[PDB]
Scaffold this motif. Structure first.
Motif, PDB file in Angstrom:
ATOM      1  N   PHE A 287      -4.546   6.862 -16.673  1.00  0.00           N
ATOM      2  CA  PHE A 287      -5.622   6.176 -15.904  1.00  0.00           C
ATOM      3  C   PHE A 287      -6.866   6.041 -16.811  1.00  0.00           C
ATOM      4  O   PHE A 287      -7.137   6.932 -17.628  1.00  0.00           O
TER       5      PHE A 287
ATOM      6  N   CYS B 129     -10.581   6.388 -16.561  1.00  0.00           N
ATOM      7  CA  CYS B 129     -11.490   7.082 -15.614  1.00  0.00           C
ATOM      8  C   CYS B 129     -12.906   7.025 -16.182  1.00  0.00           C
ATOM      9  O   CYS B 129     -13.215   7.718 -17.172  1.00  0.00           O
TER      10      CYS B 129
ATOM     11  N   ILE C 137     -10.089   3.949 -12.499  1.00  0.00           N
ATOM     12  CA  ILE C 137     -10.790   4.757 -11.483  1.00  0.00           C
ATOM     13  C   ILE C 137     -12.275   4.803 -11.851  1.00  0.00           C
ATOM     14  O   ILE C 137     -12.634   5.331 -12.924  1.00  0.00           O
TER      15      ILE C 137
ATOM     16  N   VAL D 141     -11.001  14.228  -9.612  1.00  0.00           N
ATOM     17  CA  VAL D 141      -9.807  13.459  -9.995  1.00  0.00           C
ATOM     18  C   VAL D 141      -8.761  14.412 -10.604  1.00  0.00           C
ATOM     19  O   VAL D 141      -9.077  15.183 -11.540  1.00  0.00           O
TER      20      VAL D 141
ATOM     21  N   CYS E 156     -14.065   6.516  -0.534  1.00  0.00           N
ATOM     22  CA  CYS E 156     -12.903   6.309  -1.432  1.00  0.00           C
ATOM     23  C   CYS E 156     -12.180   5.023  -1.028  1.00  0.00           C
ATOM     24  O   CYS E 156     -11.566   4.980   0.058  1.00  0.00           O
TER      25      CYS E 156
ATOM     26  N   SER F  63     -10.389   0.893  -2.316  1.00  0.00           N
ATOM     27  CA  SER F  63      -9.594   0.133  -3.297  1.00  0.00           C
ATOM     28  C   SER F  63     -10.085  -1.315  -3.476  1.00  0.00           C
ATOM     29  O   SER F  63     -10.416  -1.975  -2.486  1.00  0.00           O
TER      30      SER F  63
ATOM     31  N   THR G 140     -10.537   3.074  -6.596  1.00  0.00           N
ATOM     32  CA  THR G 140      -9.207   3.372  -7.140  1.00  0.00           C
ATOM     33  C   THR G 140      -8.115   2.644  -6.352  1.00  0.00           C
ATOM     34  O   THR G 140      -8.245   2.509  -5.123  1.00  0.00           O
TER      35      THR G 140
ATOM     36  N   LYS H 162      -5.184   6.568  -4.175  1.00  0.00           N
ATOM     37  CA  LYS H 162      -6.005   7.643  -3.549  1.00  0.00           C
ATOM     38  C   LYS H 162      -5.342   9.044  -3.602  1.00  0.00           C
ATOM     39  O   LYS H 162      -6.022  10.075  -3.356  1.00  0.00           O
TER      40      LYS H 162
END
Ligand SMILES: O=c1ccn([C@H]2C[C@H](O)[C@@H](CO)O2)c(=O)[nH]1
Ligand SMILES: O=c1ccn([C@H]2C[C@H](O)[C@@H](CO)O2)c(=O)[nH]1
Ligand code: ALF
Ligand code: ALF
Ligand SMILES: [Mg+2]
Ligand SMILES: [Mg+2]
Lengths: 192, 193
Positions: A93, A95, A126, A134, B96, B98, B129, B132
């Motif tokens: 990912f 991040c 992310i 995370v 949170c 998307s 993100t 999740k």
């Protein structure tokens, strides 16, 4: 699987070279900080120390439309991420944190990834101001210490070398990657 | 010990379904539409495709347009609940959410929506993100039927937030549905203390 979280600025995209080039173009008469002389994570605070009004001048460069979009890749970075994501039992990912002044940063970061790495890597972004919430095995990041709400993060922080942290003193407990031509495969292997 | 609550945006804080129908009726006034309480299934585009093939690209053009996310109205009681929740002792809140695959007019607009409706302190609590399950917390409040990704056993318990498209579902006795923000969310948090 081993999950690797990868920072953008100073790891994939050359923020420091972009900032210096932009400052010299916009303020051609002003003194500057050569990259070799950079110390401490926030460039703005070193410019403030050089002369107080320089702090807002250098911030105006990285807050401008196009700044994040136009950064050049770090040598070997794009090829390394491609190779890493293709390895068996490995997940990647990207991040990354936005500026507090988010307006010209959030969309430009998504477009930079789309152009340099392609649409499949955009789905691996992310965005967060707190990386400690995370879940992963490794975080590759040039920031001296990465902190937040979890006192003990799930990941081990690997310090990625950059002009501003090269001279930083570390205990044997903290590991460092010198560049993307250094041995990153052995680090991932230590988590398998 | 502190309780960490992850809160979704579309269908929980912001009224995506009402915004989508309003925009579709405005731009495509002659075309057939789906009344809100007739909605079934998470993705609105696929129910419109089933109604008539040409409608899939039309309804997508509404939620992909500049201004769509910026202009959504808040869900009743939502903003007061998030404020009250974040003010409780031993409690932490993150938003949170998307982005669309067509991300261009979505990412920046979600940040600005939070800034305007909740303020700069909540902008710093955004996590963007497409997965999740890799985010750590005790509870995830989300209208999607099932929230999936790389972790087979997420850290959080999913609390289904009631929305037009999921109202038809009946949960087993082992799980919890939140009917609305007036449905005693404090008792759910208290279960994790
Ligand atoms: O002097 C600075 C200021 C910001 N950032 C980057 C780090 C992070 O990815 C993002 C938000 O802080 O911008 C730097 O690299 N150097
Ligand atoms: O039909 C749809 C399509 C997208 N989204 C929302 C969910 C998520 O927050 C974001 C990206 O999928 O858009 C919906 O609510 N309904
Ligand atoms: F891309 Al960064 F801290 F450098 F999130
Ligand atoms: F805001 Al959402 F799924 F509805 F992340
Ligand atoms: Mg960095
Ligand atoms: Mg939702």
């Amino acid at each position: 699987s081993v999950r690797v979280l990868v920072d953008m600025d100073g790891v994939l995209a050359d923020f420091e070279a972009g900032l210096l080039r932009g400052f010299r173009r916009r303020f051609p008469e002003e003194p500057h900080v050569p990259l070799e002389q950079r110390r401490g994570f926030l460039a703005r605070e070193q410019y403030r120390a050089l002369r107080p009004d320089l702090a807002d001048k250098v911030a105006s460069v990285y807050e401008a439309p196009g700044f994040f979009l136009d950064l050049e890749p770090i040598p070997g970075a794009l090829d390394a991420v491609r190779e890493m994501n293709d390895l068996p039992d490995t997940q990647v990912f990207i991040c990354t944190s936005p500026l507090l002044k988010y307006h010209h940063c959030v969309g430009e970061k998504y477009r930079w990834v789309e152009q340099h790495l392609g649409p499949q890597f955009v789905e691996r972004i992310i965005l967060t101001r707190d990386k400690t919430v995370v879940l992963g095995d490794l975080l590759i990041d040039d920031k001296d210490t990465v902190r937040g709400q979890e006192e003990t993060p799930s990941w081990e922080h690997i310090l990625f070398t950059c002009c501003h942290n090269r001279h930083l003193v570390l205990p044997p407990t903290r590991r460092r990657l010198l560049s993307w031509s250094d041995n990153w495969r052995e680090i991932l292997d230590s988590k398998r």
